[PDB]
Design a binder for this molecule. Structure first.
Ligand SMILES: C=C(C)[C@H]1C/C=C(\C)CC/C=C(\C)CC1
Ligand SMILES: [Mg+2]
Ligand SMILES: [Mg+2]
Ligand SMILES: [Mg+2]
Length: 536
């Protein structure tokens, strides 16, 4: 009664990440210079009597350079001031940038700021088609819409067609920046990824660049990268001493991709413990998913699911030997988390992630039951099960474990499935179903999202993929709305959820599974963030 056949590609990284020894004198030299550069930058920000457009461009540059996390208080104070002054007297470039920066920071600036750029019908004035910097900022702003912003319904299409038309004749690096924006907008990109591109491909090549900011940005990126590499080494060593590579050979060996995921959720040094905890969880639920999907028999998956609900080491012997391996590793991981959080008296919060894991596994087992039965549920029923199998309710909960400022009330909010979390989960689900529809269908999975959608509504695969694309668009508007003040918890606890949605977009770009097939999408990102330093 043997098993399915292995068709997963092995880790393409080998052991190149296993040991990283930080050049300590370089670290100290970088940090010492950064302190000086950080103060110079702080004073640029606090400079009295700057014009609106100059201020917004400064803040935008500091944000794209990846160093704004040093200046949360200064940037906030400035945007707040701009928000409350109501300055509606500018051109498209400044207005669109004003709108984007304020919305991204939760300031509900009215979309009426764009009325002066439109005709009697709410269509942008085509006379603006020759203003490339205006179009570019309009373009970026168009991705931050909520449901109250139908004034902007035309902004994406308008700016896109005219940027495409202008791009081939633009000077550099402007051309490269426009071309990049059309493939990957800023708001929906992974921050370290956009930062790496901006620093190296754009700002470094700008004639007008500020030398202080550029040097700051390069040193800071390379210094954080040393931390990230230590973290990945520590995590690679943990994964190695688990040895699932050989004892659980049916499973995807993707701990580096998992680290990239955790790095997407937060890159700052204060979230180091959080990242390390998170990547371990992603790594481990990856193992569980492959057990349900590519190895376990329905009888085996039943006992596994029940063992997880009971969550007791007593239960191991009801499981086949190969499931004993992962089950003990799972239980041990949570005992590790409890020990890690003990000194800060935050051990009790681990139970929130545990309950969310039980939920994921219940729904894995349902999904397997559906496959065995040849069942094509209605879309509503399909989603009631398949949203949790994204693991995103679970990963979001997990992202909070290592965040020292997360309180019980923050977990209570998250446990009620707030709308911002639900939208992030929906984006993951529908993008995944759109990308992986064809392959899963060939493997016989009749319970696949798009199939459900086709059979339920009586519509073609094309119309179904388009209906899913639209649920993703609706979900982004809900994310954007969920960031607006007053927020139900600190922005600190919203950003991970937003970042989870961004990682989806980036991994499944151009409709391909970038996690199962890392070489396409993830590999260049991993090399740019974790292998190659920015040349100084
Ligand atoms: C649905 C998505 C995008 C998941 C699929 C991947 C797994 C279940 C393995 C670990 C979980 C990850 C990488 C989140 C993505
Ligand atoms: Mg699966
Ligand atoms: Mg799977
Ligand atoms: Mg899938």
């Amino acid at each position: 009664i043997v098993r399915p056949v292995a068709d997963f590609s092995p880790s393409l990284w080998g052991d190149q990440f296993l040991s990283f020894s930080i050049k300590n004198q370089v670290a100290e030299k970088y940090a010492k210079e950064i302190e000086a550069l950080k103060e110079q930058t702080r004073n640029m920000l606090l400079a009295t009597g700057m014009k609106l457009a100059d201020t917004l461009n400064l803040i935008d540059t500091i944000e794209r350079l990846g160093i704004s996390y040093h200046f949360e208080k200064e940037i906030d104070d400035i945007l707040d001031q701009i928000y409350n002054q109501n300055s509606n007297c500018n051109d498209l470039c400044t207005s669109a940038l004003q709108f984007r920066l304020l919305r991204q920071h939760g300031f509900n600036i009215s979309p009426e700021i764009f009325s002066k750029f439109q005709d009697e019908n709410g269509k942008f004035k085509e006379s603006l088609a020759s203003d490339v910097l205006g179009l570019l900022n309009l373009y970026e702003a168009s991705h931050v819409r909520t449901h109250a912003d139908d004034i902007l319904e035309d902004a994406l299409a308008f700016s896109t067609i005219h940027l495409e038309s202008a791009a081939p004749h633009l000077k550099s690096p402007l051309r490269e920046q426009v071309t990049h924006a059309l493939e990957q907008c800023l708001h929906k990109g992974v921050p370290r990824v956009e930062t790496r591109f901006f620093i190296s491909s754009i700002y470094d090549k700008e004639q007008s660049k500020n030398n202080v900011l550029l040097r700051f940005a390069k040193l800071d990126f390379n210094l954080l990268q040393m931390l990230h590499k230590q973290e990945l080494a520590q995590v690679s060593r943990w994964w190695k001493d688990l040895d699932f590579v050989t004892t659980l050979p049916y499973a995807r060996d993707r701990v580096v991709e998992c680290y990239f995921w955790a790095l997407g959720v937060y890159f700052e040094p204060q979230y180091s413990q959080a990242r390390v905890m998170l990547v371990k969880t992603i790594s481990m639920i990856s193992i569980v998913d492959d057990t349900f999907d590519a190895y376990g028999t329905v009888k085996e998956l039943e006992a596994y699911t029940d063992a997880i609900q009971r969550w007791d080491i007593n239960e191991i012997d009801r499981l086949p030997d190969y499931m004993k391996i992962s089950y003990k590793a799972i239980l041990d991981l949570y005992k590790d988390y409890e020990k890690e959080l003990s000194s800060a008296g935050r051990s009790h919060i681990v139970c929130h992630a545990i309950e969310r894991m039980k939920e994921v596994v219940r729904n894995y087992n349902v999904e397997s039951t559906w496959f065995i039965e040849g069942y094509t549920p209605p879309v509503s029923e399909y989603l009631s099960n398949a949203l949790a199998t994204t693991t995103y309710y679970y990963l979001a909960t997990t992202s909070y474990l290592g965040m020292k400022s997360a309180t019980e009330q923050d977990f209570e909010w998250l446990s009620k499935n707030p709308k911002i979390l639900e939208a992030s989960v929906i984006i993951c689900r529908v993008i995944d179903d759109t990308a992986t529809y064809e392959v899963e269908k060939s493997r016989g999975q009749i319970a696949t999202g798009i199939e459900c959608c086709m059979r339920d509504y009586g519509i073609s695969t094309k119309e179904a993929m388009a209906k899913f694309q639209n649920m993703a668009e609706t979900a982004w508007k809900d994310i954007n709305e969920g960031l607006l003040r007053p927020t139900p918890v600190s922005t600190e606890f919203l950003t991970p959820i937003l970042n989870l949605a961004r990682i989806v977009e980036v991994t499944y770009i151009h409709n391909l599974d970038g996690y199962t097939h890392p070489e396409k999408v993830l590999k260049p990102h991993i090399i740019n963030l974790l292998v190659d330093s920015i040349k100084i």
